[PDB]
Amino acid sequence: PTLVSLLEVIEPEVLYAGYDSSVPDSTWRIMTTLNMLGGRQMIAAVKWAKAIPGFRNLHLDDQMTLLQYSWMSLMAFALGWRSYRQSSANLLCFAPDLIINEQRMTLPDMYDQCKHMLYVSSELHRLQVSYEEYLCMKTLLLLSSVPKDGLKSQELFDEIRMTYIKELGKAIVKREGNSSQNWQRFYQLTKLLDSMHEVVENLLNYCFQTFLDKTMSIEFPEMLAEIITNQIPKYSNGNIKKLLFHQ
Amino acid sequence: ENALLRYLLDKDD
Numbered sequence: 688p689t690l691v692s693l694l695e696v697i698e699p700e701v702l703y704a705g706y707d708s709s710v711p712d713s714t715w716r717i718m719t720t721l722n723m724l725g726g727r728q729m730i731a732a733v734k735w736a737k738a739i740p741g742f743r744n745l746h747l748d749d750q751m752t753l754l755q756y757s758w759m760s761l762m763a764f765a766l767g768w769r770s771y772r773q774s775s776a777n778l779l780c781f782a783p784d785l786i787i788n789e790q791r792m793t794l795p796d797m798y799d800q801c802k803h804m805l806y807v808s809s810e811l812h813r814l815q816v817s818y819e820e821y822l823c824m825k826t827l828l829l830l831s832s833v834p835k836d837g838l839k840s841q842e843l844f845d846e847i848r849m850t851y852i853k854e855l856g857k858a859i860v861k862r863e864g865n866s867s868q869n870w871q872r873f874y875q876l877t878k879l880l881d882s883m884h885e886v887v888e889n890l891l892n893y894c895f896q897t898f899l900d901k902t903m904s905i906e907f908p909e910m911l912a913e914i915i916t917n918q919i920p921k922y923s924n925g926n927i928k929k930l931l932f933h934q
Numbered sequence: 935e936n937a938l939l940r941y942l943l944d945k946d947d
């Protein structure tokens with residue numbers, strides 16, 4: 688079995704939001720539903736990560752660390768791909784029963800929250816990213832940040848990460864080419880990967896604000912409450928090394 | 935500390 692086919696087979700199933708479209712829309716209602724949906728996506732993300740070849744060989748603390756740093760990067764990337772596959776518009780396809788359509792984007796504060804994720808979706812479209820390239824890029828997003836002093840299994844991590852950089856290389860070549868066009872493509876896809884840090888920084892500013900301000904009555908499920916609680920101090924103490932392909 | 939994530943990683947799937 689190829690390494691990319693092992694990443695394909697563990698692709699998480701599509702989750703439904705449980706959004707009653709008969710009841711009218713509101714920003715608070717959509718945000719609340721997306722947070723509950725988000726916790727379920729992240730419980731599924733743990734199961735997914737555990738099945739990535741090499742991941743379970745890292746120290747358990749590094750497994751926890753990597754999932755806690757990359758959670759929003761994984762979610763915005765997976766959502767961008769799901770949105771690029773279904774539209775053809777483009778819209779944000781959080782769930783089959785909850786798409787952020789044209790009207791929904793006119794709700795107060797919706798667009799400002801959606802625009803960064805729309806950029807991811809529009810980029811995958813513009814670059815005509817393939818299924819295999821996306822699968823390699825998504826695993827690389829899980830391996831996109833390490834602590835200031837690195838990981839417990841840093842040597843192994845660096846080996847696993849190189850293996851998936853090579854795996855992305857193999858997917859780019861499958862559409863050759865050729866071959867300065869390959870360099871151009873690797874440059875473009877790794878440049879989009881690098882831009883996810885900025886996308887995520889903007890997503891976490893809204894996320895951290897709504898979580899911390901209890902007067903907003905914006906609920907987060909335990910899975911997310913725990914990720915956010917862990918991450919907020921790490922950011923304030925500079926305990927994050929964002930790995931970059933380009934400088 | 936991060937009880938739920940630790941449980942999910944440690945448990946059998």
Ligand SMILES: Cc1cc(C)c(S(=O)(=O)N[C@@H](C)CNc2cccc3c2cnn3-c2ccc(F)cc2)c(C)c1
Pocket residue numbers: 717718719721722724725728761762763765766767769780781782800801890891893894897911
């Ligand atoms: C529009 C919006 C944006 C953000 C960024 C927030 S937040 O405050 O941080 N809270 C976050 C936790 C809201 N939930 C999500 C953010 C990003 C992707 C998400 C979710 C929930 N599901 N998916 C998802 C859907 C399909 C897929 F293929 C992969 C993942 C909220 C509440 C709303």
